[PDB]
């Protein structure tokens, strides 16, 4: 029953309204945009297969030379209002934006470094333009922030000396300054999502992670903070040494999801997953033929999977250098938007339904105990098996899009066959159930 100065703060799930908005939004978009977009995974004529946003590392490019990309930063096709429209048509309720990635190039005009959008030909405050344009569409804005900063030479991977420690104490002050800046320049921000916090330098400074959290919560009432920021007194990340969750939500499900049968533990806390369309590219990469690229249905599957287990899902986009989105990403957004427009009552504001997982798809639970069946795999039996928890019965089934009644046949105690629709919808679809519990 260990004691800790810098362990978890929250008891269970926050239930203030700002957290309930964060939760109910459910579907978000991730935007990775930075100087990495200019080379697009290619350096000096070699096209590297690793994540484009890490090209500085793959091509062993020194800071001085990487940051020279600033001279070419001039996204002439950028139009914040077009971006916001695209997110709206997709059905995303929030957008997480890279304020600064590992490269350390800031999308806002920070006063604390020269490596900022202000010292580029384009000059303009990209981040401020986005915040406004998204907020105008009713879309919340969350800030991605990489603690690790390859542009500031006070950054340390580990504290192996007193020089190291001196430099790093400066780096944490600088980092604190940037965060204060963001919180106060853009007070509509709803979340900070920290990355690049894995180094020993940070593990060794748990106290700072807890400070940063309290600090930001002071400045921004109701702001959410991800688990990835946090390390405890002992250097345990995400969950403290008593296995209690730090920060407001778990953020480890990056390009993977919890198992619907074996990882039901996640339903006990808030969490958010993120994903990429190709296998592993967050920033813009010029050649998507190098790894598997997910289809829209494969992405929709994963969104629903997340909500079915009580989590949010954030789908990544990596805009081009010119400020536009590539065709594959435009098609993806449109496809997701069409499907959400039709079936979104099963996603927005939904949660874990407490039913045993079946092979046809996922269940989600509405705000008023609606139970939705989201069908991805159509059984040749024409029967969708539904097994109810103790005390629950199924009074009715309805096809969400048409309101047509759907036959429900009891097969055994606590189990039914729900018929498929008379006409095959030809896409993943939703059947809504009315259920009754016992007093």
Which position has the token pair 């690049």? 196
* Tokens standing for residue 109: 């005009």
Q: Contact 152/175 with Cβ under 8 angstroms?
A: no
Q: What angle do CA 314, 320, 322 make, to 5 degrees?
A: 140
Tell me how far apart the alpha carbons of residues 422 and 399 are, in angstroms, rounded to a whole number.
10
Residue 228 exposure: Cα atoms within 13 Å on the Cβ side: 23
CA-wise closest residue to 95 among 253, 315, 297: 315
Q: Tokens at residue 9, please? A: 């703060």
**Cα–Cα distance measured from residue 320 to residue 67, given in angstroms and rounded to the nearest whole number:** 18
Q: Which two tokens stand for residue 227?
A: 């688990």
Give the strand order in the sheet containing 271-275.
224-225, 191-195, 140-146, 94-100, 27-31, 311-317, 271-275
Compute the CA torsion angle 274, 276, 280, 282 (nearest 10 deg): -90
- Which three-class secondary structure state does DSSP give residue 191? strand
DSSP for 360-377, written as a single string = TEEEEE-TTS-EEEEESS
Residues 6+ apart with CB under 8 A from 368: none
Instruction: Name every residue whose Cβ is closer than 8 Å to that of residue 314 and which is 6 or more positions away in sequence.
Output: 27, 28, 29, 30, 94, 96, 272, 273, 274, 275
Would you say 287 and 47 are in contact if contact means Cβ atoms under 8 Å apart?
yes
Distance from C-alpha of 371 to C-alpha of 25, rounded to nearest angstrom: 18
Strand ranges inside 250-355, DSSP E = 271-275, 311-317
Residues near 272 by beta carbon (within 8 Å), at least 6 away in sequence: 28, 226, 249, 250, 251, 253, 311, 312, 313, 314
Kindly tell me the sign of the dihedral angle through the C-alpha atoms of 214, 177, 107, 109: positive
Q: Which pair of tokens denotes residue 163?
A: 């020089």
According to DSSP, the residues that pair with 405 across neighbouring strands are 398
Give the whole-angstrom CA distance, residue 160 versus residue 166.
11
How many Å apart are CA 421 and CA 424, to the nearest integer?
A: 6
Q: What angle do CA 395, 398, 403 make, to 5 degrees?
A: 135
Residue ranges of domains in the chain: 1-348+438-439, 349-437
**How far, in Å, CA of 8 to CA of 2, rounded?**
12
The CATH code belonging to domain 1-348+438-439 is 3.20.20.80
Distance CA 425, CA 406 (A): 14
Which of 151, 137, 139 lies closest to 34 in space, CA to CA? 151
> Minimal CA–CA distance to 225: which of 28, 18, 17, 26?
18
* 12 alpha-carbon distance from chain centroid: 21
Radius of gyration of the chain (CA): 23
> How far apart, in whole angstroms, are the C-alpha atoms of residue 124 and residue 117?
7
- Please report where in the chains the tokens 């969708």 appear, as a residue: 384
Q: Are 232 and 6 in contact (CB under 8 A)?
A: yes
Please say whether the beta carbons of 155 and 200 come within 8 A.
no
Residues 6+ apart with CB under 8 A from 254: 273, 274, 275
Q: In whole angstroms, what is the distance from residue 399 CA to residue 420 CA?
A: 9
Pairing label, strands 383-387, 46-47: unpaired
3-state class (DSSP) for residue 215: helix
Nearest to 23, CA basis, from 353, 228, 307: 307
- Cβ proximity of 228 and 197 under 8 Å: yes
409, 342 contact by CB (below 8 A): no
Residue 386, CA distances (Å) to 353, 359, 377 in order: 12, 10, 14
How far apart, in whole angstroms, are the C-alpha atoms of residue 427 and residue 376? 8
Identify the three-state secondary structure at position 255: coil
Distances in Å between the Cα of 31 and the Cα atoms of 57, 120, 383 are 21, 20, 41
Cβ–Cβ < 8 Å for 396, 433: yes
The CA-based dihedral angle spanning residues 336, 337, 338, 343, taken in that order and rounded to the nearest 10 degrees: 80
Q: How far apart are CA 241 and CA 261, in angstroms?
A: 26
349-437 maps to which CATH number?
Answer: 2.60.40.1180
Q: Which helix (H) or strand (E) holds 118?
A: none
Q: Which two tokens stand for residue 218?
A: 């002071």
**How far apart are alpha carbons 43 and 298 in whole angstroms?**
31
Kindly give, in sequence order, each residue whose CB lies less than 8 Å from that of residue 85, ignoring residues fewer than 6 positions away: 137
Distance CA 168, CA 393 (A): 60
Q: How far apart are CA 399 and CA 85, in angstroms?
A: 30
For residue 24, the number of C-alpha atoms closer than 13 Å in the C-beta half-sphere is 13
What span, in angstroms and rounded, lies between the C-alpha atoms of 110 and 63? 18
CA distance 339 to 429: 9
């Amino acid at each position: 029953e260990i004691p800790l100065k810098y362990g978890a703060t929250n008891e269970g799930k926050r239930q203030d309204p700002a957290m309930q908005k964060f939760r109910d939004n459910r579907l978000g978009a991730f935007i990775h945009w930075g100087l990495y977009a200019i080379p697009g995974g290619e350096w000096n004529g070699k096209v590297y297969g690793g994540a484009a946003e890490w090209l500085k590392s793959w091509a062993k490019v020194p800071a001085d030379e990487w940051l020279k990309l600033m001279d070419q930063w001039n996204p002439t096709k950028f139009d914040a209002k077009k971006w916001a429209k695209m997110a709206k048509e997709m059905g995303t309720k929030y957008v997480k934006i890279t304020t600064k990635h590992h490269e350390g190039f800031c999308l806002w005009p920070s006063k604390y470094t020269k490596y900022t959008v202000a010292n580029t030909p384009y000059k303009r405050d990209i981040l401020g333009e986005l915040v406004k344009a998204y907020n105008d569409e009713g879309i919340d804005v969350h800030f991605y922030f990489s603690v690790m900063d390859w542009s500031n030479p006070d950054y340390r991977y580990d504290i192996k000396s007193k020089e190291d420690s001196i430099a790093f104490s400066r780096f944490l002050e600088f980092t604190d300054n940037q965060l204060k800046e963001l919180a106060t320049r853009y007070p509509t921000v709803k979340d900070f999502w920290f990355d690049g916090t894995w180094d020993a330098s940070v593990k060794k400074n748990g106290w700072w992670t807890a400070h940063a959290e309290q600090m930001l919560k002071e400045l921004v009432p109701g702001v959410a903070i991800n688990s990835r920021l946090r390390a405890d007194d002992k250097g345990k990340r995400h969950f403290d040494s008593n296995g209690r969750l730090m920060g407001d939500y778990e953020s480890g499900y990056e390009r993977r999801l919890p198992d619907p049968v074996k990882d039901l533990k996640v339903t006990q806390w808030d969490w958010e997953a993120c994903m990429t369309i190709p296998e592993n590219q967050w920033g813009y990469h010029k050649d998507w033929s190098l790894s598997y690229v997910k289809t829209p249905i494969e992405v929709i599957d994963r969104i629903v999977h997340a909500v079915s287990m009580g989590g949010n899902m954030v789908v990544n986009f990596g805009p081009q250098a010119d400020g536009d989105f590539r065709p594959e990403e435009k098609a993806m957004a449109t496809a997701i938007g069409k499907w959400m427009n039709r079936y979104g009552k099963a996603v927005y504001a939904c949660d874990y339904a407490g039913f045993e997982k079946q092979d046809w798809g996922y269940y989600t639970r509405g705000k008023n105990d609606e139970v939705y069946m989201v069908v991805f795999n159509q059984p040749y039996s024409e029967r969708l098996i539904v097994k109810t928890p103790k005390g629950i019965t199924v009074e009715k089934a309805t096809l969400l899009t048409t309101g047509e009644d759907i036959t429900v046949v009891e097969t055994t105690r606590n189990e039914y066959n729900v018929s498929v629709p008379k006409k095959n919808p030809g896409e993943p679809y939703v059947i809504q159930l009315k259920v009754r519990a016992a007093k």
